[PDB]
């Protein structure tokens, strides 16, 4: 059997797996614990991808398809209907054992990004292009990636073509106010109000008391308004890619990992790397973890559930 290992990346060399953002700090939250069941950045330790997790960093919260038509409405803004496919270009098959097309956002909110188009037809001999700011509401009833059809809005009121290859590039969030409906741990309704979600990645929770989830925290930009929103992933995208590569069989339900300062070789704190792909620590405090960014996680050994984590 192939020996299990982690990639040797420092905290400043990691990216979020739920949004295309760099990892800023480590984060715990024993208080106000919610049901953690994200779908992006989900990978078991033996290299099995779960939920809507895919390998491309540019595929996270991304969409590719064609704009069908302009939605006529008297409400503010200009809404456009868009059929979505797989990221590679192939049509999305809803009979597949996936909650949504891979890369689909796994939280409620207004995703702020850029819609770009490149025409299929050529005019005497280059295709025309266009790109505008756009917002995608994942809480909307029109947000149905499972049915291969979502809907986005623009400030532009005309310059969007129909039947042309469309790409969505995630930038951040439009707003985090009351009516914005931004909740990090609230899964979107992939099929809308039609039916409930299926083929989801399993929920995540610490088993032993006194232990809490250890998150990789990234701060996400805002189009406007007040706030300092953040996105927490279970594992960075580099870990997802690495675990998929080695495909090492898990010997235990929990693996002990150590956050080591490479300059002095010191172990700052311990952590439990669980089989399904998440970290737990024995910490009482909350908020950001004070630790050098040049520090990295190192796999120590597989352990039984008799082992107790060091106080953090």
């Amino acid at each position, epitope marked *: 059997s192939k020996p299990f290992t982690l990639p040797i990346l420092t905290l400043g060399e990691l990216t979020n797996s739920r949004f295309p953002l760099p990892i800023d700090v480590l984060y715990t939250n024993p208080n106000e614990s919610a049901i953690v069941q994200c779908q992006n950045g989900r990978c078991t330790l033996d290299g099995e991808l779960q939920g809507t997790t895919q390998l491309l960093p540019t595929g996270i919260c991304a969409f590719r398809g064609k704009v069908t038509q302009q939605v006529q409405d008297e409400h503010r803004g200009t809404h456009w209907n868009m059929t979505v496919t797989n990221l590679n270009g192939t049509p999305f098959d809803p009979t597949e054992d996936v909650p949504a097309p891979l890369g689909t956002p796994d939280f409620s909110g207004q995703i702020y990004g850029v819609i770009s188009q490149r025409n299929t037809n050529t005019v005497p001999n280059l295709p025309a292009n266009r790109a505008h700011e756009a917002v995608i509401a994942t809480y909307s009833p029109k947000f149905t990636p499972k049915l291969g059809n979502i809907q986005f809005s623009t400030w532009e009121t005309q310059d969007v073509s129909s039947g042309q290859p469309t790409k969505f590039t995630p930038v951040g969030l439009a707003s985090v106010d009351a009516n914005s409906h931004f909740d990090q741990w609230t899964l979107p309704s992939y099929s809308g109000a039609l039916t409930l979600n299926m083929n989801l990645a399993p929920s995540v929770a610490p088993v032993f008391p006194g232990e809490c989830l250890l998150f990789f925290r990234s701060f996400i930009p805002l189009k406007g308004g007040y706030g300092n929103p953040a996105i927490d992933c279970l594992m960075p995208q580099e870990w997802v890619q690495h675990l998929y590569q080695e495909s090492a069989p898990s010997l235990s339900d929990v693996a002990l990992v150590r956050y080591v300062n490479p300059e002095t*070789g010191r*172990t700052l704190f311990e952590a439990k790397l669980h089989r399904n792909g998440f970290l737990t620590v024995a910490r009482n405090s909350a908020g950001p973890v004070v630790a050098p960014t040049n520090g990295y996680f190192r796999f*120590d*050994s597989w352990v039984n559930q*008799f082992y107790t984590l060091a*106080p953090m």
Partner: nanobody
Amino acid sequence: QVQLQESGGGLVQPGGSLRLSCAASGTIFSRNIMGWYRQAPGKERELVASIYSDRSTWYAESVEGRFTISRDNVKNTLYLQMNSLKPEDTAMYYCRDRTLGSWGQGTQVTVSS
């Protein structure tokens, strides 16, 4: 026949130096994680230092910079150098095989005038 025996405990003046040892027997010493605990009267058993298979070390914030833990895989002995002692360090020090879970008898360390 698995037993851990501590040695080198006693009384000493504050700001002095003291060294503790722990001879392990009947274990796969080099593979296991070793650590030093202490227990003050009215307090719980708090982890002080811990050493791993790759000889990496961990220390508590109320100990860092003063104590030093090391291991000898040849003689299967665990050490703990204690420099610049304080009256707050007065407790019962136990050595433990954190991997296997086996404790030791524990020795007494007191620092007063």
